[PDB]
């Protein structure tokens with residue numbers, strides 16, 4: 001590429017991210033005073049393990065849906081082959097969400113936006129996966145300290161998705177070319193903005209992997225306890241990405257072709 005082509009890539013990635021923002025950053029910020037009452041938090045903790053999982057899995061899926069749209073509007077993604085498009089989303093959708101999640105996290109009070117209001121990590125006690133939950137909270141605390149801008153979120157999440165070491169890619173070099181061009185864009189924007197210093201403070205990719213593996217390990221435990229809840233009440237797309245052998249659902253392909 002070239003300088004103008006790189007800056008055009010910066011604007012195109014940032015646009016594609018805004019359009020597929022689930023919630024505008026301002027909407028999330030204006031709600032920061034709206035905090036679950038102690039009584040409301042007690043009600044969350046007393047809900048059954050399997051209903052909490054169903055509600056959270058459904059919210060997770062909604063977020064995942066916006067990440068698919070981001071991909072479809074992202075330069076070069078839709079020129080990749082369908083096998084590679086699915087490998088990328090299958091492995092990176094949960095990662096993009098975990099990163100996007102820091103916009104919904106308030107480090108002042110350590111709360112996360114969820115079902116209309118902000119609550120701390122006790123809100124999630126009914127799930128029986130406190131390690132996962134505190135890892136995600138801590139992970140969102142780390143990212144919140146860097147004070148990402150929205151533009152920086154878009155460029156960074158683009159790279160989280162366009163990761164050419166995902167196993168199973170058929171056109172690895174084509175994904176390499178794309179990844180390298182988004183890296184230059186990201187780094188060009190940080191340099192231009194005097195923000196290269198965040199580069200040494202980004203999470204190792206091994207960390208995003210770790211959280212996703214914890215996600216799936218805890219899903220398998222829950223599914224073994226409530227197999228019929230998963231079969232009858234989890235979102236199909238969620239089963240496709242995360243459960244086993246749940247990928248008999250072909251939702252992603254449907255999503256990727258539907259205009």
Ligand SMILES: CCn1c2ccc(OC(C)C)cc2c2cc(C(=O)NCc3ccc(S(=O)(=O)CC)cc3)ccc21
Pocket residue numbers: 021022023024028052053056057059060063097100101102103104112113114115124127133136137
């Ligand atoms: C660690 C605590 N936590 C969860 C823990 C587990 C879990 O699912 C498992 C049960 C499978 C799901 C959640 C979960 C979901 C939300 C959520 O969706 N809030 C609504 C929202 C809407 C838009 C944005 S955004 O615009 O910033 C783009 C992402 C952010 C947030 C918040 C916290 C959560």
